[PDB]
Design a protein around this ligand. Sequence first.
Ligand code: SF4
Ligand code: SF4
Length: 55
Amino acid sequence: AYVINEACISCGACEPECPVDAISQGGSRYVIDADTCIDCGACAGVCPVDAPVQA
Ligand code: SF4
Ligand code: SF4
């Protein structure tokens, strides 16, 4: 699983780019469903602040 850390500015650009639709808008920051994420790294590639990190 990847996890979106506190650098997230909630721009929303990663949500459409997740191939398995694991990302959604949350309170404060976007969130990854760890039971769906397959570690492709696509969300970090479109993140301007590089908030998604592999855990
Ligand atoms: S690493 Fe890939 S599967 Fe996981 S949330 Fe990011 S884009 Fe989706
Ligand atoms: S692209 Fe990055 S800054 Fe924008 S919502 Fe996703 S994790 Fe947050």
